């Protein structure tokens, strides 16, 4: 960025100094935050096993070591969602169990957690023509189940008791 000779700082977003000019040497340097991100944990049932896999949100798998130790590079497979630790990549594709994101899914299979691309479903091709039809010759009656909530628990809370429980002075301040 080409600062004007009378310009010192730079604020493209109007609340943080994007770039500054060093006084000793008039060259200008741009400021970038130190990176961050949330930490999420992949896990099967607690009583199923104890192995877990951690996911860092939207960070290159280069700053994760210098970021519960990482313990060097051991299957540091990188995805669009972020850095995935503790799971092997699988070329096979199955249905989803734990949706991690961006077409990726993980599940516990008998290194205990595998991650795979989303498998959409069974493929099938229709034997189409212009003079062929299909008609069932038998049937089958099936029964399914659906559940729908109707009402929530009917609750009411007192006003003064919660706020200023049995205090005259607190009530007087409240009014």
């Amino acid at each position, epitope marked *: 960025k080409k600062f004007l000779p009378f310009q010192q700082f730079g604020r493209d977003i109007a609340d943080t100094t994007d770039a500054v000019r060093d006084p000793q040497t008039l060259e200008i340097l741009d400021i970038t935050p130190c990176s961050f991100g949330g930490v999420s944990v992949i896990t099967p049932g607690t009583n199923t096993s*104890n*192995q877990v896999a951690v996911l860092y949100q939207g960070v290159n798998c280069t700053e994760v070591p210098v970021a519960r130790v990482y313990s060097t590079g*051991s299957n540091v497979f990188q995805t669009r969602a972020g850095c995935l630790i503790g799971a092997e990549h699988v070329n096979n594709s199955y249905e989803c169990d734990i949706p991690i994101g961006a077409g990726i899914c993980a599940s516990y299979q008998t290194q205990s957690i595998i991650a795979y691309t989303m498998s959409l479903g069974a493929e099938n091709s229709v034997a189409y023509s212009n003079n062929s039809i299909a008609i069932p010759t038998n049937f089958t009656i099936s029964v399914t189940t659906e559940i729908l909530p109707v009402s929530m628990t009917k609750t009411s809370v007192d006003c003064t008791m919660y706020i200023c429980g049995d205090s005259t002075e607190c009530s007087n301040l409240l009014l």
Partner: nanobody
Amino acid sequence: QVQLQESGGGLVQAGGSLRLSCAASESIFRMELMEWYHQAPGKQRELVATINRCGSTNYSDSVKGRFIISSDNAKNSVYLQMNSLKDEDTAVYSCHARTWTSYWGRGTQVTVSS
């Protein structure tokens, strides 16, 4: 650094004595599980000996009587002494550890001359 490095492999005639020694940078004690894996050529990997955190020790059927797994708490490592070596014991040995994610080491190709 290699979080777990193995040493002791090499060639040896049948019936000799050998001590596989793989050492890990991290404390061998919070790791909760040490194990050794060797795979014969043309064969699948198999477990050799396991030692849990509590101290329970188990050996494979072709391992009892000769191979004993140990771990001295002076230099953090695990020890595995081989003796009365026989030719099908020739394989690529690797020691396995699992604190909350699998760890693996390389090397230690043992050959038994017969």
